[PDB]
Target: Putative cupin_2 domain-containing isomerase
Amino acid sequence: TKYKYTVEESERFNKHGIDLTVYGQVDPSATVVRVSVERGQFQEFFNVRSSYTYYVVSGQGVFYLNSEAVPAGATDLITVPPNTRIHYFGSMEMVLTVAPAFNEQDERHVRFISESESPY
Ligand SMILES: O=c1ccn([C@@H]2O[C@H](CO)[C@@H](O)[C@H]2O)c(=O)[nH]1
Model:
């Protein structure tokens, strides 16, 4: 039984301005990944099934949740329910929980965001 997953073993890639570490643990109830962001996620999406919960390890930023600004700093917990439009700006390290388990097909692209819109 493989309980532990390391960064060394993970899939690491850039998507829409963020750096993701996807450990590749399989569990139907939740997917937990690491997010590093220097300026922002320059894409707005919503997920029809899963809540996205961001724990801010370090840094600061601002989430836009159905266009509402939600400031965030280190140790804050940002919980986004399904069917909520999400993008964000900031310089942050985060732990993201997608529950139930992340499925890319549950995601709906709304728009791209201009890289100049980020004040970070
Ligand atoms: O397993 C996961 C979890 C999250 N994300 C992406 O991480 C971002 C979280 O803001 C979104 O673009 C979401 O699609 C993935 O690509 N895979």
About this structure: The beta strands are 11-15, 18-22, 31-37, 40-47, 51-65, 68-73, 77-80, 86-99, 107-112.
